[PDB]
Structure 1
């Protein structure tokens, strides 16, 4: 039966789901690792022991343990990201949407969700891959991994909690796709891993990690790169935060074994309840447990790797949104409210730049402010607000990505860059947040197609363009149709620096995406902070 597939791990029973008045197969909740429960907490992922009998892969699995967002109870704009499945440490599973009839060897796309490495679920609605699988005729796989301390606590040196296990969970899923996607009609030699936010950063991290390069063909990163200031930490920092977490639950801190044991005896929600008390600074866009530069998963500093071309060469398709910062200021910076225009004062503006650039000393905070302030109108609430919005976005998403892309292209086999700047017509967040972090996702997964979602005709059009770009890129290594009569997406070159818009208007090509502010963020401020 089309809904029955035999994989090296065992047989699997899927289900037929309806999609835009048609149907495709869906194998939901396939296990790709042994449940990281019990003494395996913090440990590296172990291969899911094969099973005999048919596995019911007709419904979604549990979502890993994670901090749920209760900032706006009932608000759909914030809960569409909260887990919609019973949380559980036993969450390592993957989902595959398969066209019908089943292909024989089509392009495959594995999706890695975002969430600041402390949250994320493959079962969210905007992550439903039936529309993409169906529309572009591709086998869509969305994996999952351990977020938070559960997947990132890092006591370097120990084998019980080495760290980066979350990324290992990911790789394990990628290996399972390499080894079995063929039985689902997928071409294991044409897998394109794509993610957003922490997911995009992850993608870049597999491109950098030798132990992963061999497991995928192409790569797509959205609103995030491996070198983002929040994506990784040093073993030292990671260790420090581990102890702090332990100290928060009154753990014996005499040895790693003493500490690790204590953390394993704590219920999941106990670690979650104090997770945020470990950060080193009062800051915005910073998460407790994230990938550490251990020397293993990451041979050396991400920068030297980038500089020495020590990374998988291939084609990549990445980009950012116009208002990345807005979401983190609403949640932490003083002055922003979900229900107001959030006009910011010079007092609060300053406080924002403080939270935004946590590692900066006074001179640094000064440089930033000077660089993002209209002194001919230093008291404009809208300016102070948007300026702050920009700061959070450039520093944390746009500029780090631009560094990456600039460093990669110099060794890559093709680079395509996009600047997504269309605000959905159905967005329920305040107008001031603009093109919000993670809202390009819905167009990538073609939600504008299903009418009951209330998108505009053009928005549906946009979705389809994107979906095709992504798919066509995954299949070929280029987002463009071989011979076409409509708009070429220029290749990004270290010389031209060309890039494109992604909105409901006629796409237009541009150059040097936010160079100005990124020469400051990537080249100046660093020098500044180091000299001082």
Structure 2
């Protein structure tokens, strides 16, 4: 049988699924770990005890316990990102989409979802791997990992809540793929991890982390990098937040044993209810429980590992969207709303930069303001709006990724860099939000191929180009076809620093993506804040 696969964990039964008037195989909700429940909340994942009999892998698994956006009830723009399954701590499952007939050993792509380490699901409509598996003849895996306090509460020194266990969840999925993907026709020697947002940051963390490096060949990072300021905290900051969480649930704080015991007695939703009370600043684009720089998962600080070349040397492909900031302003910054142009007064501008750069003294705020204000206009509400949008994207996504790119590229074996700036013609969010954080994903997964979803034809063509770049890169470490009359996406080099626009127009090649601003965010501002 073709839906029956025998693995090292036991036999698995999949389903036949329709895709663009053809079929492929799908193995949904395969467990790669023991359920992290009861005593095991906050602990490292345990490998899944082998089972006898056949595991029914015909439906999606549960999603991990998490915050649910309810700002816009029924609005597909927001709800497309919420859990579409029952939430459970019992959530360590992966899903595999396999071509029909089954290949012998093809390229494998493992998807790691985003959501700021506080949210995310492998089971979302946008993450359905069937279009990509079918179109590009690859085995598509999507894993899951604990998020929020459940995956990132960090009481360093303890084994009951060591920190980073959500990242270890990911690694265990990768270990499982390494060990068992051969039985699905996957090539374990050619597996590409890819993710967006925190998933992109996670991908870069697996590049850095010595314990993860041997488990994949290549990586793609979308709008995310390990050195992003929201992506990690120190062990002491993690400890403060752990304690502060316990303070919010009236827990005993005499010791780590008594704190963790108390946090384990709580129902999951009780923790989720107070998750945002623990942030030490009034901020946006900052999340309560994220990876810690612990000494185990990362031997030293992220920056010295990048400087010294302490990372997996391979090929990477990565990029960013035009308007990464706009989501976080909508949700957390005064003046912005879903149903207006959101012209921003001078006061909401100043309020906005405070929120965007929370550790900045007054001089730091003046420096940002000077950098992003048009002083010819100055009071124009659109320019304030757009300036603020650029501040949030540049600081949190574009400029950290550019720092990573420039430092990876000195020691790596190939970088390809993209800037995705197509506004989808069927987008539900207002025009002011531009090319939004997360909306290249639908092109990478081929949703513009399905007629019922109301994309344009030139959008179908863009998605096909993107799926082909991604898959070819997974396959060979180059997104380009050997022959191909189409224009080459060139390597990003230290010297020339070339990247491409990813849009419906014929490919233009640019240089030095946002250098003026990234010299400000990566060199000048830190030096300024350190000297004060």
Q: TM-score under structure 1 normalisation?
A: 1.00
The offset of 1:442, in angstroms, is 0.1
Matched residue SS, 2:317: strand
CA–CA separation in structure 2 for the residues paired with 1:143 and 1:189? 18
The C-alpha deviation readout for 1:76-111, integer Å capped at 9, x for no partner, is 100000000000000000000000000000000000
Instruction: Give the whole-Å Cα distance in 2 for the aligned partners of 1:429 and 1:324.
Output: 14
Q: What whole-Å deviation, never above 9, does each CA across 1:441-471 have from its counterpart, x for those lacking one?
A: 0000000000100000000000000000000
Following superposition, the deviation at residue 256 of structure 1 comes to: 0.3
Count of paired positions? 532
Q: Secondary structure at the match of 1:63?
A: coil
Q: Distance in 2 between matches of 1:58 and 1:369?
A: 54
CA distance in 1 between partners of 2:57 and 2:69 (Å): 28
Q: Shift of residue 351 of structure 1?
A: 0.3
Q: Where does residue 448 of structure 1 map in the other structure? A: 448
Once residues 462 and 425 of structure 2 are traced to their aligned partners in structure 1, the CA distance between those partners, rounded to angstroms, is 12
1:302 paired residue number:
302
Root-mean-square deviation over aligned CA pairs? 0.3
Pairwise CA distance, 1:254: 0.3
Measured after TM superposition, the shift of residue 269 of structure 1 is: 0.2
Secondary structure, aligned partner of 1:300: coil
1:137 shift after superposition: 0.1
C-alpha distance in 2 between matches for 1:169 and 1:161: 14
How far 1:424 sits from its partner (Å)? 0.8
Q: After superposition, what is the alpha-carbon deviation per residue over 1:151-185, rounded to whole angstroms, capped at 9, x for unaligned?
A: 00000000000000000000000000000000000
CA distance in 2 between counterparts of 1:416 and 1:39 reads: 44
Q: Deviations over 1:24-80 (max 9, x none)?
A: 000000000000001100000000000010100000000000000011111110000
Tell me the secondary structure at the aligned position of residue 368 of structure 2: helix
Cα offsets for 1:396-451 (capped at 9, x unmatched): 00000000000000000000000000011110000000000000000000000001
**Structure 1 residue 337 displacement after superposition:** 0.6
Q: Secondary structure at the match of 1:5?
A: strand
Structure 1: how far apart are the matches of 2:420 and 2:144? 25
Distance in 1 between the 2:51 and 2:268 partners? Answer: 28
Distance 1:26 1:261 in 2: 39
Residue deviations 1:273-309 (CA, integer Å, cap 9, x gap): 0000000100000000000000010100000000000
**Alpha-carbon displacement from aligned partner over 1:207-239 (angstroms, at most 9, x marks no partner):** 000000000000000000000000000000000
- Matches of 1:424 and 1:93 in 2, distance apart? 32
Q: Secondary structure at the match of 2:300?
A: coil
SS of residue paired to 2:221: strand
Give the aligned partner of residue 348 of structure 1: 348
C-alpha separation in 2, matches of 1:358 and 1:367: 14
Distance 1:266 1:530 in 2: 41
Aligned equivalents of 1:478, 1:21: Cα separation in 2:
30
Q: Equivalent residue of 1:334, what SS?
A: coil
Q: CA deviation at 1:246?
A: 0.4
Cα distance in 1, alignment partners of residues 84 and 503 from structure 2: 30
Deviations 1:225-279 (A, max 9, x none): 0000000000000000000000000000000000000000000000000000000
Question: Quick check: 1:165 aligned with 2:133?
Answer: no
CA distance in 2, matches of 1:259, 1:143: 30
In the aligned structure 1, how far is the partner of 2:469 from the partner of 2:116?
26
How far residue 507 of structure 1 moved from its aligned partner, in angstroms, is 1.2
After TM superposition, the structure 1 stretch with the greater mean CA deviation from structure 2, 478-487 or 20-29, is: 478-487
Match of 1:371 in 2: 371
Structure 2 distance, partners of 1:62, 1:352, is 37
For 1:350 and 1:451, how far apart are their aligned partners in 2?
45
Aligned to 1:138: 138
Q: Distance in 2 between matches of 1:361 and 1:155?
A: 29
Q: Partners in 2 of 1:106 and 1:265 — Cα distance?
A: 46
User: Once the two structures are superposed, what CA deviation does each residue of 1:105-156 show, in whole Å capped at 9, x if it has no partner?
Assistant: 0000000000000000000000000000000000000000000000000000
Distance in 2 (alpha carbons) for counterparts of 1:361 and 1:460: 47
Once residues 423 and 264 of structure 2 are traced to their aligned partners in structure 1, the CA distance between those partners, rounded to angstroms, is: 44
Q: CA deviation at 1:326?
A: 0.4
SS, match of residue 211 in structure 2: helix
Aligned positions of 1:238-387 closer than 5 A: 238-387=238-387
- Following TM superposition, by how much is the alpha carbon of 1:483 offset from its aligned partner in structure 2, in angstroms? 1.4
Q: Which runs of 5+ in 2 are unaligned?
A: none
Q: Find the aligned partners of 1:405 and 1:107 in 2 and give their Cα distance.
A: 24
Superposition deviation, residue 480 in structure 1: 0.1
**Structure 2: distance between partners of 1:71 and 1:497:** 40
SS of match in other structure, 2:25 = strand
Matched residues in 1 for 2:70 and 2:282: separation? 20
- Displacement of 1:374 in angstroms is 0.2
Question: What 5-or-longer segments of structure 1 have no aligned partner?
Answer: none
1:188-207 equivalence runs, <5 A? 188-207=188-207
1:484 to partner: Cα distance: 1.5
